[PDB]
Design a protein around this ligand. Structure first.
Ligand SMILES: Nc1ncnc2c1ncn2[C@H]1C[C@H](O)[C@@H](COP(=O)(O)OP(=O)(O)OP(=O)(O)O)O1
Ligand SMILES: Nc1ncnc2c1ncn2[C@H]1C[C@H](O)[C@@H](COP(=O)(O)OP(=O)(O)OP(=O)(O)O)O1
Ligand SMILES: Nc1ncnc2c1ncn2[C@H]1C[C@H](O)[C@@H](COP(=O)(O)OP(=O)(O)OP(=O)(O)O)O1
Ligand SMILES: Nc1ncnc2c1ncn2[C@H]1C[C@H](O)[C@@H](COP(=O)(O)OP(=O)(O)OP(=O)(O)O)O1
Ligand SMILES: Nc1ncnc2c1ncn2[C@H]1C[C@H](O)[C@@H](COP(=O)(O)OP(=O)(O)OP(=O)(O)O)O1
Ligand SMILES: Nc1ncnc2c1ncn2[C@H]1C[C@H](O)[C@@H](COP(=O)(O)OP(=O)(O)OP(=O)(O)O)O1
Lengths: 239, 239, 239, 239, 239, 239
């Protein structure tokens, strides 16, 4: 047992992928570990996507991880637009002007390559009510595209949901990828199968509440973020 | 994806029909886009109709758009009276004198033609508690009369309301028309199905609050307007 | 629509029964129209009755309208006494002397006939907590006595009040009579069902505040009146 | 109605018990009528008691009315002392000398009989925080002792006060006695239930302010009185 | 009541301990009665202490009363020094010479015995912010030392002050001792709980103003005193 | 019977192994007696393991008892890690840093020996759906390893469960060991065969509810504990 515990102690990854933008999230969660499913929730339009997109951007650009993004609602172009804008601290969607300027200026092409040049991000859309068709694509993003993190955006709150979540967790646990699923709050396996659940609350000062973190057991409010309506980034707040 | 994003970027209508009279509304909303439902609310007699009528007048006269107005409460004659007065910066209802003068003077006929001469405005009244009868007329105002904007005045705050709002949003999203619905605040799908919600607050200095704007996410108070009791127009305020 | 709007324009009664004694009331309200309920309020002993009685006297004497007065608190004799005194610019209640003089002098009889001779005023008292018994009498004062205006004095600030106000407005709207209700301020449907609300404020210089006027939307203070403790009349003030 | 109004006019008591000492009080109030509650107030030691005692003395001696005095604070002996002194234009309390002289001289006995000989005044003390015990005694002073006026001295500014005032007014209104209550100002039903409120103001020149008079509506300052420190009487002032 | 009033009249102490030095004080106050609290006030160094000390000296020497003096600021020795000097019409504090002469001359001892020999005066110092500790000592000076008058020197202008004054008045009223409290003017219960308030005003010609006297109601200026800088006595002035 | 009852009275173990950390548990249970099965339950991640591990640590270190721990879910290394951290008031799992520091520093080895040096704790993992294979190991931990207490972590809520619980209780009753079984609440013999059932409730303030205690019959809430997220210990709370 002695040598058995030692090797155990010197090989256990307690700290996972670090989150960004919210002083406190890491304190209460220790980051996202591989094999865990991260649930991010809150009311519609409350900021789930942005928050997750922001983490996706950092993990993939700063942490050198390959991120896969599977969109159920919006298209790749839309997601790409958001990612590109985010990376350049600008909101492409909110400005027909900048959008047209970026094409002729040749900045779009430069921006596209600066972000997607390498094989870091993998965006997939076109996701029917079939779990198995979905799981197959997820597993390919892992095995074939070597994604470290896979974000699933998104799902709405049971057989279906239950079986999906059960298949999602199994997939996560067996491959060791980090799965972050965004879900809308307008449930059962949701709370059970998820390892960590993050909820965003508002009323641009967003309160980040840790509804659950298996690994740490530390729940409660992690901190506050402030949305910069100009850059589109969620920033840490001195609240 | 590159060429896929490019065409996406050079074909996305971010800025919709511009609002008028309130320095700030456009800043926080980017105008009214086609396919979206605009909710305008506030207490009774607080100024919803006027505000919407004013936007209707500009969109149809200045923007060259065809506007349809479906009245559930008041009649066409009443609405027309308001539109005509508005256009001529005069309050016909508040003056038996001007009303009688306008007939003999021949100005009424001249004013009527100057406003309704073209096929720009389409007023319909005579709207029973049947949604389907209503939706049918709306769809005709779009397809048959080619309205760019349809204003529904009005509705009072669930099956009925819920199904109506769900049918209204579906209609809006599928045709691409801009639907602005006025509703009284003395709800469920109301907040959910609406893309942008504008609330007017008073105590003639009216505060315009953006309760919700999907497209932009920018909420809060857009600005202040001042009602000119002489012309009947809501004017921008230096508050 | 053209000919439809024309006839509409040349048949709309914008200006109703003109108020008297307060330079400004008419400006902000355009008078009392038939079918509307006028609410007159303020603290006890603040002057509601006098003010309304004064309007009643003018409408019935000068405007040639038949006025019905339904008293819930005071008796017909009391009301009559006030009306008679008002008409003769004298306060009968404040002088046992004049009261006794008026009988022997034969002036009372002359004064009574000069005011009540014709069928202009209809005073009814003896109004139990039954709305339906009340509404029945009101409807008779309209249909049977042909009253143009009916004053209800008075009511104290909900089922009861709510249902009463809802029945009062329905009665007013359906018959087209002008209903002026006096209410004490020491509410719900009160503010909602009332078309115009007039509030009197003091500390004999009375401030007349227009708390609400559907038809015009013009609110605020209409002007100031001065109570003549000698004649009992509320007079216009140069404040 | 004619004969109904006539009898009404020739049977209405507008002028009540006349006040004394203050040229103007009667002008603004028309005296104290039966069934009304008179509130007399002002700061402690400002002169309420004296003023009321003075009215009590006149009503009972000159007007031939039976006056009941219910004291909550001071004793009968004290009150009697004040009444006796007042009647003889002398301040018994301020002079041990006169007090001792009046006994041997036989004047006390003569003075006592000259004031209390008849059954005009009824002094009662010994008034616990029980309203019902109080009301019972009041009703007896009316029915049993036939008092025309009952003075309650005194009360300090709510259930208790509210219920008391409500019971006081009910008692007054139902029996027709004149109730004058003295209250200290260092309120709710006080202002509401009282028919006339008299306030005394100083800095021996006392300003008499009519804070309220239902019957007449005439408020404001009635006049000025001057306290004669030698006789103890409040006299009319030429201010 | 007759015999009840008689005994009342022949047992009422209207005239209390007579004041000295100011022709007029007694006229407006009738002296200090037992059970009353006398407030003596004015600006610092204006002469409160002297004035009160002077009254204390007379009451105790001439009137044969036992006087207790409770000092909050100065010590017993200081107070004694002032009393001794006062009694001998000399200012001990202003003369190191006389002070040294009085010891050897044996006059001090003779003067001490001539003043304090009997058990007439009781000086106590050493009075912490505790009311209850203070009240206990006061009650002992009354009950145990049999003081007729207790002077409290002094207090500075609320819970504390309010509760103290309320406890002081209660103590005074319940025992019947005469309490004279000196207070500094640089309030609430002060004016209320005090029975008589005397204020000294200057610019050695001191104006004595009676700010309040419950018992008599006679306020205003009582008279003028002149300070003899040689004897330390306040003398009556012919102003 | 007399001598029969006496020896019975002087040989009955009413108080068993005392629990720790929760002021009240012992009051309502009198501790854990040999031959009884203790059920500890609550929702997942609610704190069962920690609580039991804490009791295990004390029983084995302070009470000098030999504790056996049979893990069905986690491994020995994991359990050992928790025990070691607990003993040193530190959370090894939550800190890659401390984990690496403890190896080189030589503290791990020192900590391991300080806890496991003696033959006090017996951890066994690797527990298939076979009851009989399980019971065999349990019986060996008792007979062969001489464990006083055996903790079974854990079981999820019937033949299987029923037969297992029936075999567990039989084992406990026949050997006299103290068996504490942890079970998840997301039943039949569970409630029946268990002698004492402890439930933990949260929302780090944990409510300890005694759902059942045969021996005492005292049920209800024993008290509150507070989780120290820094040391990993459940502490008594002053709630
Ligand atoms: N009361 C508590 N407050 C906060 N965190 C706690 C508390 N109790 C335990 N934890 C933390 C420490 C662990 O990392 C995590 C889970 O505790 P644990 O005892 O393993 O729960 P459990 O045994 O009831 O659940 P399960 O076996 O079902 O996963 O949460
Ligand atoms: N905290 C915030 N403050 C202000 N605007 C925000 C905030 N977060 C996001 N937004 C803006 C940017 C977007 O245009 C819009 C919606 O954000 P988004 O992340 O798409 O919400 P969501 O993903 O939670 O909602 P849903 O998927 O349900 O529509 O609002
Ligand atoms: N801001 C304003 N200040 C003053 N008057 C106004 C204002 N807005 C509108 N009005 C006037 C003009 C109209 O005669 C009247 C009512 O306006 P309107 O737009 O019809 O209110 P609304 O549509 O919100 O109420 P509703 O439908 O519930 O009766 O008040
Ligand atoms: N503005 C005024 N100034 C002075 N006296 C007034 C004024 N208005 C009315 N009065 C006088 C005349 C009446 O005798 C008395 C009460 O007037 P009244 O109209 O009966 O008040 P009100 O109807 O508001 O009160 P309520 O019904 O609650 O008793 O006061
Ligand atoms: N009227 C006066 N004219 C001149 N000197 C006076 C007069 N009264 C008192 N003094 C002198 C004697 C003392 O040495 C000094 C202060 O008198 P004192 O009675 O102690 O004042 P005070 O008691 O009002 O003030 P405090 O307690 O606030 O210091 O002034
Ligand atoms: N106007 C006055 N001027 C001077 N002294 C007056 C005046 N009125 C009354 N007094 C005197 C006579 C009394 O001895 C004393 C108090 O009068 P009193 O009527 O008892 O006051 P009050 O009844 O208002 O006060 P309270 O009941 O609160 O003590 O003052």
């Amino acid at each position: 047992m002695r040598e058995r515990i030692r090797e155990h102690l010197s090989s256990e990854e307690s700290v996972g992928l670090l989150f960004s933008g919210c002083t406190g999230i890491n304190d209460k969660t220790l980051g996202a570990r591989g094999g865990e499913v991260i649930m991010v929730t809150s009311g519609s339009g409350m900021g789930k996507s942005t928050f997750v997109r922001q983490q996706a951007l950092q993990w993939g650009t700063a942490m050198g991880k390959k991120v896969g993004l599977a969109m159920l609602e919006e298209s790749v172009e839309e997601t790409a637009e958001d990612l590109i804008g985010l990376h350049n601290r600008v909101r492409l969607r909110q400005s027909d002007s900048l959008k047209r300027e970026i094409i002729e200026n040749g900045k779009f092409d430069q921006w596209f390559d600066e972000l997607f040049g390498n094989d870091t991000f993998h965006l997939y859309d076109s996701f029917e009510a079939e779990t198995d068709r979905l799981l197959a694509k997820l597993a390919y993003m892992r095995s074939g595209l070597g994604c470290d993190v896979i974000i699933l955006d998104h799902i709405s709150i049971r057989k279906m949901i239950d079986n999906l979540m059960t298949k999602l967790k199994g997939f996560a646990k067996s491959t060791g990828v980090v799965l972050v699923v965004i879900c809308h709050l307008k449930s059962g396996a949701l709370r059970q199968l998820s390892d960590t659940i993050i909820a965003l609350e508002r009323n641009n000062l967003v309160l980040v509440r840790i509804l659950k973190c298996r690994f740490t057991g530390d729940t409660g409010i992690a901190g506050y973020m402030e949305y910069n309506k100009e850059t589109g980034w969620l920033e840490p707040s001195s609240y």
